[PDB]
Design a protein around this ligand. Structure first.
Ligand SMILES: O[C@H]1CC[C@H](Nc2ncc3nc(Nc4c(F)cc(F)cc4F)n([C@H]4CCOC4)c3n2)CC1
Length: 341
């Protein structure tokens, strides 16, 4: 057999023989993830197991789209695959997809919990921006960009793991909404700068060491947002569909708080004249990115030329060349066909 079977806690990993010394590093939604040594490449890898992803339209649509996009895109700030396999041999036997990529050191949650100098905080953000630039350059507007799905190496390098939104599921695990734009929360139209909102919830969180806009669902969460940023302006709501519009125009009012109040001097490496200039620079971007009305919110390319981010700029990283419903039966075939080719 090309394959061997280990009990990664509860479930069973049945992987190629090359992958030795498995250790559980990520349990979550579509997949269990393990770290491994790859004796063919002689490096460590992350290996994620899709357990029966055709089981429903949700798991399936994500699995397949992510499979599809994950082979067409070519950027170092966006996940690359090193290998994919099923240990089952026919479509009728088919069950599990295994997804293999470069092993990283930490996710962004863990990194957010740390004090970062400006050089790191900004280099991270420059990279989130390059990857989104890439996704956008191909027609993918992510819209659900969050730090539990972004990974980092000790040398401060970064990859985004997933490809965003296209949704019921019998589950323990809740979806994370906090980084979602007002357009997604209020079912609006949207454009490529919808992802900038997400980046600013991230940036803000790195500084604040607290989730900016938490909450139980879209009710608590729209609240947490207006009572910090203010009620939005008339012609923003002018773009809200009558029923959503009714609800918003009728919520309590707030003038909102200024950006030095939201992100006080306390929170910034601001000891030298360097970190003083960089601190005021960060807040200036923060306030261009935490902007409810997408019409007034900074673009991806403009943010890429903000002086806080501009120092890392590089054409090869920025202007890099770019690339329905089904039954469970039909998704299985779709997914099995991409896995095989
Ligand atoms: O405490 C530390 C946290 C970071 C961890 N390093 C790490 N490195 C690479 C990873 N790739 C994926 N997922 C994934 C994959 F494997 C293949 C894919 F096709 C797509 C993926 F999304 N994950 C998971 C684990 C948790 O965060 C996401 C990875 N985790 C080391 C331990």
């Amino acid at each position: 057999n090309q394959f061997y079977s280990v009990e990664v806690g509860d479930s069973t990993f049945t992987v190629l023989k090359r992958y030795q010394n498995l250790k559980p590093i990520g349990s979550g939604a579509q997949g269990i993830v393990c770290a491994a040594y790859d004796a063919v490449l002689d490096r460590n890898v992350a290996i994620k197991k899709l357990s029966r992803p055709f089981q429903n339209q949700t798991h399936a649509k994500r699995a397949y789209r992510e499979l599809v996009l994950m082979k067409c895109v070519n950027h170092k700030n966006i996940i690359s695959l090193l290998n994919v396999f099923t240990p089952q041999k026919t479509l009728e036997e088919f069950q599990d997809v295994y997804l293999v990529m470069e092993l990283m050191d930490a996710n962004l949650c863990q990194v957010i919990q740390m004090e970062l100098d400006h050089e790191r905080m900004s280099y991270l953000l420059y990279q989130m921006l390059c990857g989104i630039k890439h996704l956008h350059s191909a027609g993918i507007i992510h819209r659900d960009l969050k730090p539990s799905n972004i990974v980092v190496k000790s040398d401060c390098t970064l990859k985004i793991l997933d490809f965003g939104l296209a949704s019921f599921m019998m589950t323990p695990y809740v979806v994370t909404r906090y980084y979602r734009a007002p357009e997604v929360i209020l079912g609006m139209g949207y454009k490529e700068n919808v992802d900038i909102w997400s980046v600013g919830c991230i940036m803000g969180e790195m500084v604040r060491h607290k989730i900016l806009f938490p909450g139980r669902d879209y009710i608590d969460q729209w609240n947490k947002v207006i009572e910090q940023l203010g009620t939005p302006c008339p012609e923003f709501m002018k773009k809200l569909q009558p029923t959503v519009r009714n609800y918003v125009e009728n919520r309590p009012k707030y003038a909102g708080l200024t950006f030095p109040k939201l992100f006080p001097d306390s929170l910034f490496p601001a000891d030298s004249e360097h970190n003083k200039l960089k601190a005021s620079q960060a807040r200036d971007l923060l306030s261009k990115m935490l902007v409810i009305d997408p019409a007034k919110r900074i673009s991806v390319d403009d943010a890429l030329q903000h002086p806080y981010i501009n120092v890392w700029y590089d054409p090869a990283e920025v202007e890099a060349p770019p690339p329905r419903e089904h039954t469970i039966e039909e998704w299985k075939e779709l997914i099995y066909k991409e896995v095989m080719n």
